Amino acid sequence: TGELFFRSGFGIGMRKDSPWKQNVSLSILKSHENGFMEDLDKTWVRYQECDSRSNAPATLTFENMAGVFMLVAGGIVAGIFLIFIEIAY
Amino acid sequence: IVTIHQEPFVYVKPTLSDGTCKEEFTVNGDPVKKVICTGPNDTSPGSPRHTVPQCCYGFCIDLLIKLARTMNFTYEVHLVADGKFGTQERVNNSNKKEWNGMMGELLSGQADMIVAPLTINNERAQYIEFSKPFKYQGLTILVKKEIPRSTLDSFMQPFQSTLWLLVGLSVHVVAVMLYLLDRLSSAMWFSWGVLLNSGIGEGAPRSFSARILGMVWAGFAMIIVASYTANLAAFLVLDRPEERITGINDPRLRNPSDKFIYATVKQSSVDIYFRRQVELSTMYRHMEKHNYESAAEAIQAVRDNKLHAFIWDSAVLEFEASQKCDLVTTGELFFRSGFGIGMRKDSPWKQNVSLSILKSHENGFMEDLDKTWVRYQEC
Amino acid sequence: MIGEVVMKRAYMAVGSLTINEERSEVVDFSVPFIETGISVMVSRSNGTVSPSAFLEPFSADVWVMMFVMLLIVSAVAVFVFEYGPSFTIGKAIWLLWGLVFNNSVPVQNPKGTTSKIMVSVWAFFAVIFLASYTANLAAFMIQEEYVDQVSGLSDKKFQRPNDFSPPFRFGTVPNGSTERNIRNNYAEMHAYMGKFNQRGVDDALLSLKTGKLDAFIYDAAVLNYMAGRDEGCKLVTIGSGKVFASTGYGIAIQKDSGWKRQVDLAILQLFGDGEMEELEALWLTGICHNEKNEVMSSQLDIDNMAGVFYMLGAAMALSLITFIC
Amino acid sequence: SYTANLAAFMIQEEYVDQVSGLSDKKFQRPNDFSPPFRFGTVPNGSTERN
Amino acid sequence: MIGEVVMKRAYMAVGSLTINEERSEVVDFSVPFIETGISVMVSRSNGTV
Amino acid sequence: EGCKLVTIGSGKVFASTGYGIAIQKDSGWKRQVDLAILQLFGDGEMEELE
Ligand SMILES: O=C(O)[C@H]1CN(CCCP(=O)(O)O)CCN1
Numbered sequence: 001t002g003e004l005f006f007r008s009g010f011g012i013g014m015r016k017d018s019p020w021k022q023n024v025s026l027s028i029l030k031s032h033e034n035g036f037m038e039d040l041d042k043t044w045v046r047y048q049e050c051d052s053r054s055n056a057p058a059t060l061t062f063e064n065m066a067g068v069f070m071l072v073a074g075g076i077v078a079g080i081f082l083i084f085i086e087i088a089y
Numbered sequence: 090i091v092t093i094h095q096e097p098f099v100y101v102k103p104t105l106s107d108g109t110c111k112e113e114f115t116v117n118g119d120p121v122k123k124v125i126c127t128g129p130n131d132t133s134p135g136s137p138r139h140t141v142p143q144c145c146y147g148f149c150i151d152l153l154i155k156l157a158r159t160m161n162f163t164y165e166v167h168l169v170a171d172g173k174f175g176t177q178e179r180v181n182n183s184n185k186k187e188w189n190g191m192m193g194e195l196l197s198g199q200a201d202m203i204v205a206p207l208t209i210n211n212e213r214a215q216y217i218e219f220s221k222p223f224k225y226q227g228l229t230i231l232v233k234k235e236i237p238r239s240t241l242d243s244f245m246q247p248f249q250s251t252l253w254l255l256v257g258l259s260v261h262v263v264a265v266m267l268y269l270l271d272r273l274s275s276a277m278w279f280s281w282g283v284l285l286n287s288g289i290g291e292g293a294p295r296s297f298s299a300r301i302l303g304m305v306w307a308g309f310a311m312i313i314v315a316s317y318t319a320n321l322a323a324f325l326v327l328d329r330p331e332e333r334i335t336g337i338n339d340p341r342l343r344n345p346s347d348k349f350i351y352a353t354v355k356q357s358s359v360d361i362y363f364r365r366q367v368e369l370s371t372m373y374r375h376m377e378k379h380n381y382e383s384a385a386e387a388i389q390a391v392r393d394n395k396l397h398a399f400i401w402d403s404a405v406l407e408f409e410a411s412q413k414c415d416l417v418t419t420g421e422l423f424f425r426s427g428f429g430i431g432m433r434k435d436s437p438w439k440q441n442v443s444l445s446i447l448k449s450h451e452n453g454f455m456e457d458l459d460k461t462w463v464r465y466q467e468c
Numbered sequence: 469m470i471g472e473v474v475m476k477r478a479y480m481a482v483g484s485l486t487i488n489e490e491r492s493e494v495v496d497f498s499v500p501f502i503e504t505g506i507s508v509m510v511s512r513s514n515g516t517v518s519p520s521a522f523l524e525p526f527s528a529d530v531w532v533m534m535f536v537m538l539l540i541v542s543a544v545a546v547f548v549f550e551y552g553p554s555f556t557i558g559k560a561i562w563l564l565w566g567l568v569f570n571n572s573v574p575v576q577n578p579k580g581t582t583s584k585i586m587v588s589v590w591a592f593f594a595v596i597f598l599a600s601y602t603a604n605l606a607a608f609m610i611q612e613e614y615v616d617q618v619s620g621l622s623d624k625k626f627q628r629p630n631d632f633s634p635p636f637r638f639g640t641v642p643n644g645s646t647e648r649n650i651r652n653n654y655a656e657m658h659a660y661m662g663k664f665n666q667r668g669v670d671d672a673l674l675s676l677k678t679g680k681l682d683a684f685i686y687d688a689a690v691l692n693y694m695a696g697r698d699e700g701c702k703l704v705t706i707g708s709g710k711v712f713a714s715t716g717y718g719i720a721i722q723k724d725s726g727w728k729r730q731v732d733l734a735i736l737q738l739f740g741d742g743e744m745e746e747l748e749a750l751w752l753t754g755i756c757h758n759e760k761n762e763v764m765s766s767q768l769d770i771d772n773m774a775g776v777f778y779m780l781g782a783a784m785a786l787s788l789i790t791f792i793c
Numbered sequence: 794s795y796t797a798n799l800a801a802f803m804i805q806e807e808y809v810d811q812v813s814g815l816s817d818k819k820f821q822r823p824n825d826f827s828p829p830f831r832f833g834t835v836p837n838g839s840t841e842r843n
Numbered sequence: 844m845i846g847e848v849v850m851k852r853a854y855m856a857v858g859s860l861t862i863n864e865e866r867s868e869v870v871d872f873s874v875p876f877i878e879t880g881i882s883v884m885v886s887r888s889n890g891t892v
Numbered sequence: 893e894g895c896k897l898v899t900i901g902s903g904k905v906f907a908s909t910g911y912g913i914a915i916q917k918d919s920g921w922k923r924q925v926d927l928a929i930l931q932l933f934g935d936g937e938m939e940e941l942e
């Protein structure tokens with residue numbers, strides 16, 4: 001959730017006065033230019049197993065509207081006794 | 090005393106033939122104090138620049154009368170010439186910037202005091218002296234409320250003509266199929282009655298191959314009706330008028346376009362505030378070509394579908410919107426300030442005036458004044 | 469600017485200068501203060517209602533449960549009535565089915581006082597069920613917009629657009645860095661894009677709006693700036709997370725200059741303090757950037773009501789099959 | 794149409810009494826309406842003295 | 844704070860200091876940076892009838 | 893907690909006053925200090941502080 005804040009980047013750390021800074025930076029730039037970084041991203045960080053979108057409104061489940069069935073069951077249980085008494089009288 | 094024309098605070102009306110204000114009484118049954126202030130006509134002087142007297146009254150006049158009674162001194166009220174509040178600007182002559190309006194008149198000595206809704210800001214606080222604010226207020230925006238109309242087309246809106254035609258074909262198809270499966274007008278009547286729920290006909294499809302079709306048709310009709318009702322309800326709910334500005338930070342105000350027009354009164358505190366801002370250059374540039382010469386004129390223009398928004402003091406806009414029933418103040422107050430009495434530096438009235446203002450605020454005299462001249466909310 | 473810096477006529481260059489493998493052997497770049505790359509901009513969509521939305525309000529448990537309950541109620545009513553055409557088991561089911569669906573189809577009333585109470589209770593249940601279904605369907609009609617985004621220069625829509633619906637017709641401005649990068653990386657895409665060359669960036673937006681184009685490939689920063697100030701917010705970029713050949717805007721400095729370390733430290737300090745976000749808030753953010761998808765519920769079409777028609781056709785076919793048997 | 798319009802009209806919001814403040818009949822004449830308005834302040838202060 | 848200012852032990856008093864007719868004969872106040880007074884606080888009402 | 897309370901508008905306030913800075917009875921600093929405060933009302937820093 002939210003928008004990215006404190007934009008930064010990942011880099012290779014080295015000690016000062018190390019004879020690898022320029023070559024490492026040039027190699028990183030070349031990899032960016034020639035699409036090696038894109039291939040690496042598509043190989044390791046690339047997955048859409050379960051996407052997301054605007055969730056639909058909730059649907060009424062059995063427990064959400066389990067009152068009408070109980071009311072009708074009570075009505076039928078009362079009606080059986082009513083018919084029994086009517087036949088008996 | 091130099092005063093300006095502000096409806097909530099300074100009412101200006103023509104005098105009678107004999108040269109006296111018409112007698113008037115308030116609701117409680119008390120006279121309304123009035124004074125004779127000599128000033129030009131409502132419009133610009135121009136050729137007929139005769140200064141015909143026009144006695145004025147209002148909340149500011151009552152405050153001035155109270156101040157005069159508290160400390161023994163006589164007054165002589167008059168209106169300003171240019172009809173502006175005051176600002177610093179250059180002239181076509183050598184570059185010697187000078188004030189105009191009430192501020193210029195006070196500085197030039199033509200007036201000894203200012204009694205009017207004058208805001209307190211740093212620009213004009215370096216030349217004159219202000220007393221304690223006798224009314225705290227801010228800056229607000231006034232717009233015209235839109236009538237809540239319904240933009241609904243004919244009843245056919247929820248369903249496109251193709252769907253209507255398909256339903257019409259389908260009803261006939263089901264009727265004919267049921268008639269054929271029976272072995273007729275009876276099938277068509279039954280289908281129409283089921284679809285429209287009219288209870289016409291006595292069709293009895295005893296065939297076991299037609300009861301299922303009839304049940305399916307009834308379910309389809311119920312589903313269609315429910316879908317139509319739900320779509321109509323959803324469309325009606327989501328049909329609302331466009332939102333208002335709702336504050337000065339509205340993106341619409343940030344980006345000025347010919348579609349939306351907003352301005353204020355030329356040579357006022359609002360103009361200085363907008364010009365001094367560094368992040369509001371676009372708004373100031375847009376408003377520079379639409380500012381009006383008076384508050385009443387701007388109110389009338391906004392009322393008659395000519396101005397979209399008017400930025401002005403809250404104390405005046407609230408009163409205006411409480412007696413029109415068609416104007417509304419939108420947004421939150423910004424640039425909070427107060428109204429004070431302006432005077433020249435080194436005058437023997439500043440301390441006494443400030444003490445009198447504080448005493449009036451504490452005792453409750455100010456309140457009364459607000460109730461008498463303000464707080465008329467009827468909308 | 470690069471020539472001026474190299475020619476010693478200036479010490480630093482401030483502006484929208486890109487960093488790349490070349491152009492660095494003659495000038496030293498500082499830490500970038502803004503990201504950029506090769507992104508794709510496409511027009512926004514709205515979306516409609518699902519064909520099966522007419523079954524969304526109730527779960528399947530509900531429909532089957534109500535079916536079984538109706539069968540049980542019909543059987544109980546028949547048994548109670550058992551204690552010319554007085555009543556039948558096959559007619560009670562028809563009457564109950566008609567009652568459930570707004571009670572439109574003609575039915576035959578029972579001839580028993582006891583059965584009348586059961587019929588009334590079933591009618592009450594049916595009215596409650598219909599009201600609940602209508603309310604849920606009305607609630608479901610509130611549909612928001614959906615952003616049909618793409619992975620970006622890595623999906624079949626760009627690699628093989630000729631094996632699906634009419635091609636996306638993605639295009640870019642030729643004779644530029646982006647075209648060279650596309651040619652060097654993906655020859656097939658560059659060859660295919662030759663039929664959608666756009667002269668300028670101003671006309672690209674008009675072409676996309678009209679419908680002549682479906683995707684514009686260009687620099688990320690320029691595309692974001694243009695999208696921010698759209699007259700209707702109908703254009704949206706692909707996103708910062710999916711950008712090809714990412715780079716940044718930097719400050720050109722003289723080679724082996726002692727100010728490079730201080731400049732980079734100052735830029736990093738500005739990033740840490742939070743001044744960059746404030747600057748982008750007023751200089752880069754457009755009219756509409758932090759906006760959701762408008763609901764703007766639309767009407768119903770044949771595609772929207774496809775499920776109901778399919779169910780009706782299936783029921784008709786089943787009826788015909790039963791008649792044949 | 795009637796059902797749809799009624800459903801649309803069923804949406805309601807909150808409202809404020811919008812009392813003038815120490816100048817309306819609620820505070821001046823509490824007995825006209827339900828006398829027990831139950832409004833008070835903190836004693837031994839500037840507000841009570843005022 | 845008012846006593847400290849009067850007693851010459853301080854030059855200014857910064858805080859939530861209210862301006863009034865009294866207390867002004869011994870010290871001089873500046874332009875107020877915040878407004879206040881007497882106000883009424885009440886709960887909210889549903890109002891859905 | 894819960895945002896169940898509310899207060900009347902600033903316009904409907906009785907015995908309005910303000911918060912100030914106490915200074916010596918006779919001192920030129922005030923003449924400048926006031927201006928400084930007014931400056932804060934022009935640049936808009938008061939709104940941000942609030
Ligand atoms: O590095 C630069 O010089 C500028 C120029 N860029 C335009 C790129 C044009 P194309 O991608 O080659 O078609 C925009 C910002 N960077």
Ligand SMILES: O=C(O)[C@H]1CN(CCCP(=O)(O)O)CCN1
Pocket residue numbers: 835836837838839840841859860861
């Ligand atoms: O007077 C002051 O210096 C302070 C004290 N105030 C408290 C007022 C409490 P009550 O209303 O009189 O009971 C708050 C700010 N001003």
Ligand SMILES: *[C@@H]1O[C@H](CO)[C@@H](O)[C@H](O)[C@H]1NC(C)=O
Pocket residue numbers: 019020023
């Ligand atoms: C860095 O690269 C240069 C060629 O660009 C090479 O001569 C040098 O040996 C490299 N440095 C190291 C430490 O390998």
